[PDB]
Design a protein around this nucleic acid. Sequence first.
RNA 1: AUCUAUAAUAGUUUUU
RNA 2: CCUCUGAAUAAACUAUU
RNA 3: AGUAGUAACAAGAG
Lengths: 51, 732
Amino acid sequence: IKCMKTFFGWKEPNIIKPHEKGINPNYLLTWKQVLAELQDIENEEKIPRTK
Amino acid sequence: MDVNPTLLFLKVPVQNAISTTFPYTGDPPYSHGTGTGYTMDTVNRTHKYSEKGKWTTNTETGAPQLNPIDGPLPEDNEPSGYAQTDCVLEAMAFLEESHPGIFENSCLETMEIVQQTRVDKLTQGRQTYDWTLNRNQPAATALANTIEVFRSNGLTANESGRLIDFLKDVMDSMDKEEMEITTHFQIGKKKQRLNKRSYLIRALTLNTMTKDAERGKLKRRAIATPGMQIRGFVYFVEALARSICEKLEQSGLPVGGNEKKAKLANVVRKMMTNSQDTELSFTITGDNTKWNENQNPRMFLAMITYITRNQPEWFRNVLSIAPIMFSNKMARLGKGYMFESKSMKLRTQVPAEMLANIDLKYFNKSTREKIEKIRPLLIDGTASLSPGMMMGMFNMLSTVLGVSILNLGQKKYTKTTYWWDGLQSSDDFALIVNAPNHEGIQAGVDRFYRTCKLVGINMSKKKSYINRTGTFEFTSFFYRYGFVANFSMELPSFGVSGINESADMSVGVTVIKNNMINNDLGPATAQMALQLFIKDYRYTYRCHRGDTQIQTRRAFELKKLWEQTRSKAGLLVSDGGPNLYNIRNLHIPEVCLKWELMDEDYQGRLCNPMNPFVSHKEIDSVNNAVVMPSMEYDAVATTHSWIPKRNRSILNTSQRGILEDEQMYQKCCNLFEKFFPSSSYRRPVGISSMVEAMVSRARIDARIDFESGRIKKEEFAEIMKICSTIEELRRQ
RNA sequence: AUCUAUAAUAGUUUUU
RNA sequence: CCUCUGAAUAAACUAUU
RNA sequence: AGUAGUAACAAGAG
Ligand SMILES: [Mg+2]
């Protein structure tokens, strides 16, 4: 979390090079979920060992 | 500037940097699924190498058998198994001629070994194909089950405790019309009756599987596991072969390590000195293609028959049984295959017992061809494999055969201006050929090649090469005017063994020391290896230094211990202490190294005999003298000599009841140690039952104590009464 | 000067 | 839904005990 | 999909 905060310039994620055999929207949603849950754990006034 | 590591060889000779050619820092290849394909390929290839032989049907098992002995002489360079019996006999005869009395003395020593060996020798090993369960079991478990079945079938010569009596039991069981065994299911006990042919097929069967974690091979291969009936005969035959090999200079077995390197260097230098100063000398680094698939058990029978001439008949029979059993051997196919349906998205397991009459629409082209070729050989769920030695068996007898061919290279036998000698180890060889000119070298190489062809030995042309004497390779040792060091080969040994904290520390330091002594590991690299090992140890066992802030579940206790301790250097690394090891003290145990730095309370807690992490004895009440547990790499037992858990898979099978049995066995064994203290130290030998021996020992001890005044007459009377009660219980 | 005692554990070597 | 389980070839040699 | 490679995993059983 500390290292993520040190960077400014986040944009809205978009697919630049798609995976031919995959489902790219799933990757995009995975990234969004990671961001959301990072914020969530940051909002619970305690960081656990595992999430 | 593109970096090309290989170009380093333009200045450093390849041998002097050979360790760079071993990529032994990555994980080795593994086998994932079934081994049936490899077993079928091996069987088909073994029969293809002998296709021009004689086909017969075994009258006892009914299995087709192929006999390439005395077959047509080859007309090309393809591998072939048409060994000539007269040539093998002549090779043995000339080997005897060159070393008079070798076979006689070997047979004398082997007769002593055979007459002395005990049955418990069979408990050695890792696994064994148990014919009563059609799968692999621990060697001791397999032996126990076989003894139990034999006792249930009235075959009790093994009670003598001699291995040869167990072999007599095996032979007598071969003649039983029927056999009866017990089977478990969902954990009831049921009885199964095997007719003569079924039991005979089971007795000649070797299980097969795929080998995992082998370096330097792109493709996988099959390995075999012998059954219970054949282990003893193979053991005796290999004892004879070992005795023979110990008396030959060209033999690369059964010596190893520094002694092997010294022997090879001495032999090579003697060959060089014997070479004249006006004749060319060449060395061939050679490999033999499919050694074990071309050697035939019948030729080993012939060799044993020639070796054991003028010997008692019983010795000859007990030695000859092994090749007889191996020429009528069967091969288990394996797990089978797995089928997948994409439309229905399902998977299933197809056992190998169904391959006999399974429709071939499921399989691909290669597997279909394998099954079609191998079907004629299938009987009772196995495959008939008469020719060939399966895998890694009779290594020393093969060494004897190779050394005989090497011995055929003396001038008294070549009868010309060229000659040869060299080193043999199972199937690997180095050949030194001396001749006045190059044409002589060519003639000698050709004669060696053809003589090997006569005895069923094929020299791998694409893996063998020849150069001037002075450099070669033998059994992964690279000789360049002397054997060179190869550190990468032993590199995987560096790390954490996984026994426990104390043993792992000892193993790491000892490995560093030994590689300094042997593999030319330098001082600075030794220090860096020590640092890396301590880092890995701390990370694995969560025992970082107490004055750090590494978050682990064990950090709180270590921090408390660190704070309460006055002498920090006395703490072990397992207790968060510092590292006191350097080059000069790699040979000293850690606890002994810092004994004179430990606090009295910490030292007493560490070496407290009443620590539940190590068991306790029962003499008097408990031997409260030293921490006592099998103490390999653990000189002094402390609280860090704990024992980890056990795998619990069997709990979900029908064999879980066996757990109980072994536990009960331990119980009984424990009691036996209260009567015979030396049993743990040295293995007891006797024919009487455990209860009878214990009762006799109790009576004699009571008499001795009463006579010497150690006990009073009331105790003597009570002990005698209890002994009589035990005698009464014995009958009921 | 010679020097293969046993048993346990782990590691290494032994492909058409 | 719930219970349990996370997978031991042969020979020789090397090291420690 | 992916790991992977001559056969498997992508949980198994009760
Ligand atoms: Mg070779």
